[PDB]
Structures are given as structure tokens and as C-alpha cells.
Amino acid sequence: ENLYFQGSMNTIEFLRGRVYLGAYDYTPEDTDELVFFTVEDAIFYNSFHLDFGPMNIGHLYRFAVIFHEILNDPENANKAVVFYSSASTRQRANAACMLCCYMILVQAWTPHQVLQPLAQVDPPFMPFRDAGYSNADFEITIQDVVYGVWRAKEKGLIDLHSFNLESYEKYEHVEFGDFNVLTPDFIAFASPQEDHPKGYLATKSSHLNQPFKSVLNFFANNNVQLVVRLNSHLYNKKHFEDIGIQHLDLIFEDGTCPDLSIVKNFVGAAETIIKRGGKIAVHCKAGLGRTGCLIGAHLIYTYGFTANECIGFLRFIRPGMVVGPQQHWLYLHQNDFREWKYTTRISLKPSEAIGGLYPLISLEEYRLQ
Amino acid sequence: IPTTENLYFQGSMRRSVYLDNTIEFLRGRVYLGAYDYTPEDTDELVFFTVEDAIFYNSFHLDFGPMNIGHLYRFAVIFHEILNDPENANKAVVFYSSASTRQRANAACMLCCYMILVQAWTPHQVLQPLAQVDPPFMPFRDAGYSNADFEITIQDVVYGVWRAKEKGLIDLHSFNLESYEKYEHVEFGDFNVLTPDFIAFASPQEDLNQPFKSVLNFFANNNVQLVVRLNSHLYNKKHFEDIGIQHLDLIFEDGTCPDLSIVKNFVGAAETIIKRGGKIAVHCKAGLGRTGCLIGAHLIYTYGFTANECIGFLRFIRPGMVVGPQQHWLYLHQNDFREWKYTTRISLKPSEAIGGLYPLISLEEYRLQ
Secondary structure (H helix, E strand, C coil), rough: CCCCCCCCCCCCEECCCCCCEEEEECCCCCCCCCEECCCCCCCCCCCCCCCCCCCCCHHHHHHHHHHHHHHHHHHHCCCCEEEEECHHHHHHHHHHHHHHHHHHHHCCCCHHHHHHHHHCCCCCCCCCCCCCCCCCCCCCCCCHHHHHHHHHCCCCCCCCCCCHHHHHHHCCCHCCCCCCEECCCCEEEEEEEEEEEECCCCCCCCCCHHHHHHHHHEEEEEEEEEEECCCCCCCCHHHCCCCCEEEEEEECCCCCCCCCCHHHHHHHHHHHHHHCCEEEEEEECCCCCCHHHHHHHHHHHHHEEEEEEEEHHHHHHCCCCHHHHHHHHHHHHHHHHHHHHHHHHECCCCCCCHHCCCCEHHHHHHHHH | CCCCCCCCCCCCCCCCCCCCEEEECCCCCCEEEEEECCCCCCEEEEECCCCCCCCCCCCCCCCCCCCHHHHHHHHHHHHHHHHHHHHCCEEEEEEEECCHHHHHHHHHHHHHHHHHHCCHHHHHHHHHHCCCCCCCCCCCCCCCCCCCCCCCCCHHHHHHHHHHCCCCCCCCCCCCCHHHCCCCCHCCCEECCCCCEEEECCCCCCHHHHHHEEECCCCCCCCCEEECCCCCCCHHHHCCCCCCCEEEEECCCCCCHHHHHHHHHHHHHHHHHHCEEEEEEEEECCHHHHHHHHHHHHHHHHCCHHHHHHHHHHHCCCCCCHHHHHHHHHHHHHHHHHHHHEEEECCCHHHHCCCCHHHHHHHHHCCC
């Protein structure tokens, strides 16, 4: 009501006389009518390669705190707030998408409400590209990210009120395991790497490095019941099994797309663990590409995301997920994933291929059993 | 379309050219430029634009994409330039003016050309366009409210490619003269969208020339059901007089239909299609409400995304799916797809669709 009933009586209007979105390559002067703020120097995206956005949920949380402090300042009670970025098409895309995600997640706006101010802006915003090294050939838009973040909130996958910013920022760091809790069911992480940082004669010290220790301890404390490895071996799986966590290999080559048989095995394995109330932690080398393929397929199967929405939501939590040709692969198989809800069932007999969990089987076979 | 050099096969090893404000599609052969002046042909380069001759005809603030008739005419001009002996050792630079809307139209038309004429795949035509600065203007709808939904070149390319893969577009049998004639107001303002569907503007009767033109075409092109979605502007008896079933499924102008209406429409269309007939659908303009129902059937049948479906519909008939109908199609696309598994065509006719067979749950089907 500081938002909707107050204000002033190259800028986009979100709420008349109260919230605007500008783009300036300079620092505009505050007036008795206007207060301008940017977050670009403190809140910024860390590119893998030529990806530049969108901003992630931690960025958004920090923006919301800053935004609210400006809105709640009695000094600004009769002012229009102009959130602004620099004038590049990439920085404008990041600022606009982050403000939209704010309205979706904090203010319960609907997608068409937040997208109406942004439509047909000239110059257009730069579409978001993947984090891989090949030339971009697939883009997602603010519309995709907004719809994905909105659908995820509607399905209970995003809850800014329980969001722990300190935990999010800690575990995204390489030295603490480079992982993100994506949903209540899934963790995506980079492969642990077994080494010997204390040498080979430190007989009363673990040879596990700090990121490996951090991953094992968080997993043991947060009900991870299955770890799925998608890349070549860089560690001995016994470290997970000795701590009570099932370990499953579903390896396919770096940067490639999985055979649907691998995807079907993964969905069945994940369904078995979710039915028990457990979490599934999935890694490839980076925990971005191959990992996004399998988790993304399960999200589409479960929640009905479009492939573009699924990619946008995944990247909002963990930047860089789904790489290169994996984007077109998810886009082209999304109907397959969604409609497995009708053409498959969870088998009643265990499968050795997924370590005794239950695979997805055809409808005619669940009839037999 | 005259035959020309085949740009699918690896072809001839040709040297790259480099120009500012120019994107490379095929090294040494096909480039896309954007210039506010008229560039001069060199001995290594021939430039051409079609902005002087191929016009998008906007309803309100829509600006594109260019339609299949536009694309067909572009292909003829393009092939003429490619087949000219004077150009055998030049790079062809297709270009537009520098506005983000005109660049969007030119880029999308060239992509649709590569998809439809040269058998390129979406990731092949989209790679040259990704991350271009400044970006292309996304495409907006033809309605009068402020835009709140955009489709991209990626959406249009994927929808046109999927349509081609499903046999809904075939430039070898495409009749440009018929296409251009019948979209004129005085000849009925209609387009054949697919082998199964025609979308048209409502006829008007105080018969005038566009009404007669519609009746003549429908009688000779196997339309077996006309579906009216708007208030009555003509006497339906004239369609029945030529043996075509007429059905009202009227809902309010500028709104979205109840799913019960959509389910009835899909069952009606399936009944007609199974008998080998076409369905012709109109509202007032034959764009908004018409796009909702035909789009739902296309998604149900072929698995288009909503964005692809809108892109393909507008590629054949500009302006289809208006305002809030875009978000509606987007939010219900899973519903249309899931009906393939949760429903069957009833075996009992329904008088709510004039004796055709509606969609019913697997349950009611079991009893039957």
C-alpha cells in the first residue's frame, strides 16, 4: 500500500506514479518527484562464456530488499521510483526480467500484467542465450522466464518467504560443492573430484577435499536418498554409499543429449525416491547441461512446463543449465515427457538398470503385471 | 518457383565475405544486411531488397511476419537473382531498412525460405540470427489493446518447420494466384489454412459479390461444415442450400471460449475430417475467435506449441489469435494435447453440434 496508494501525482511504467523502469548510461539526479536507483555494480551476473542472464533468485532476493528499503523510506512517500540499468540490450534485459520476477514472486502479479509494460519496447531486449561454447542457436525470452518462474511459484517450487539467501550463496561456491537445491525434490551439482590435498601419508586425515566434504554432509543432512552421476568417474562412489545414499550411473557424453531410455530410467528412479519422500541429487561434470536434460524432463513430466519455461526456471535457480543442442532436444521432446503421464506407468517390479528402483513401463505392461 | 542451385547439399567451397551490418547464412553466397541507403553492386556482391514491392498490410500495430504469399514471391525474385549468369561468382545480400521491425520481417522471411525451399532445419536458420545487436523486434498481435504477448522468429521458424514436416505446407502445390485472390475483401477474405481448415471473415447480407465468391469456392473445394462464432450477419440457409452443414458455436467478441465449446468444436471437426471434408470457420474478422478453435485443433492433432501454432497461423493468415486469446491458447495448450489420451470420439451423435460426434471421456466411452 506503500506500493499501490503512494507515489508522485527511456522509461517504462509499471505502476503509475510509483514504479518505473529506465535505462541510463549516466546517474540521473533525484528530485522532489523522482528517486532513481540501480543495483548493477553490486548485483551482477557471472558469465560462464557468453551467457549474460537472466539474474538468479539470489540476485532477485537482494534486489527485493533494496527495492523495499527505497519504497519504505518516508522520504520517498510521494515519489516515483525509477529502477534503472545501463543502456546495453543485455543489461536492460536483465533489469527488466528481474523486475518482472519481483512482481511475480513478491507481489503476485500475473504474467500478462508484468509483460504488458515490456512489449514492443524499442530497442528490444536481448534474448537470453545458453552458457556453452558453440555459437548460439536457441534463445529464451523474458516471456519464457516470467511464465516459467510464475508456473514454478504456482506449483509450490518457489517460496521467497522460506528462501535462505545465505545457504543459496554459500553452496553455489566451488569450494562448498557448486550446487543448488532446485526444487523440494532435486539438487543439481558439479561432480565431486577426488584428490589428495594433504598428500598420501596423512593417515589420520580424510583425503576428501572441502567441496566433497560439504556435499556429503549437506546431502546426509537434507534427505538425499539417491545420487545420479551422468559424467565419467572423477571420484569413488563408495563415499556416498558409505553415508547411506544410493548411487546410480546414467552416464552419457559431455554436451550430448540422452537416449529416451536413459530419460525413462531416470524418471522412474526419481519417482521411486520421491514417493519415499527423498531428494535426488544429480551431477554431470558441471551440473548444468546433461543434468538439466534429465531434471528438466522430470519437471515437464510432473508439472507441464513448456521447454522454454523449464529452461528459464532452471536458470533462474542455477544459471547456465541446459547447454547447446540440449536446448533444441528438450524443446523437441517436451511433448514426449509431458505425455508419459498417459502412456506409461511406474513398473511394479524392480529394475537392475536403476539399482532396484522402479522404471517407467508402457501402459500395456502395467496392465499385465 | 524456378529451379535454382541446391543449397542443402555441401555444394561448392566458397570464400567468406565480410561486411558490416551483414549476417552470413551461407558462406560466400547468401547474406542478410540492413542498410538505410541503397548499396551498390560490386563485382563480388549483388544486393536486393523487396521492401519496395512486397508489403505487409497491418491491421493495427502488427507488422509481421510476412506471409506465405509474400515468401513465395520472395523466392521467385531470389531465384531469379541466383540464376542470373552475371551473378555466378557473387555473394547475394538480401537486405531491408534498418528498423528493428523491417529487419525482423526480412530475417524471418529468409529463414522461412530456407526451411521451406532448401530443407534447412530450425537450428541451421536460427544460428545466424542468435544474439544479433540490435535485436529483432518480436512479433505482436493485430488487436487494439496494448501488446502483452510476443512470438519470436524462433517460434515462427519452428511452427513453419513443423507444419512442413506434418504435410500442412507444400510450396510445390501452393497456388499463389488463388491465395492472393481470396484474401481480398471483395472475394470473401479467406485463407485455406491446412487441407482440413479454412478461416474466413463473416459474410454479410442485408447476395453480394464476396458472399457468392465464398459460396462458389466452398461448393467446389469440399467444405462440409461451416462454423459461425459471431452474431448473425447473414442467413445460414444459403450454405445449407448448397448442401453444407452450418453450425453456430457463438461466443463473445474479443473473448476466449469455454473448454466445453472447444471440445465440441474438436469433435465436430474430427467427424468432418474422418469423412474427408473441410471445415470453414468464421467470426467477424476470421482472426481472433477463429484462431482459438482452429489453433486448439492443430495443437490437439499435431503437437504444435501455442507459440508455434500462432506463428504458423499468422504465416498463412496474418492477424490470427488476438489479444488475450494468445495467453489463453498458451495456458491451455496442455489441455488440447492431453485430450488425445483422456477422450475419444463418441459413437452417439450430439445435437449441440448438429448431429456430429463430440469428445467424451474414456469413461463414458467404455459404457457405450
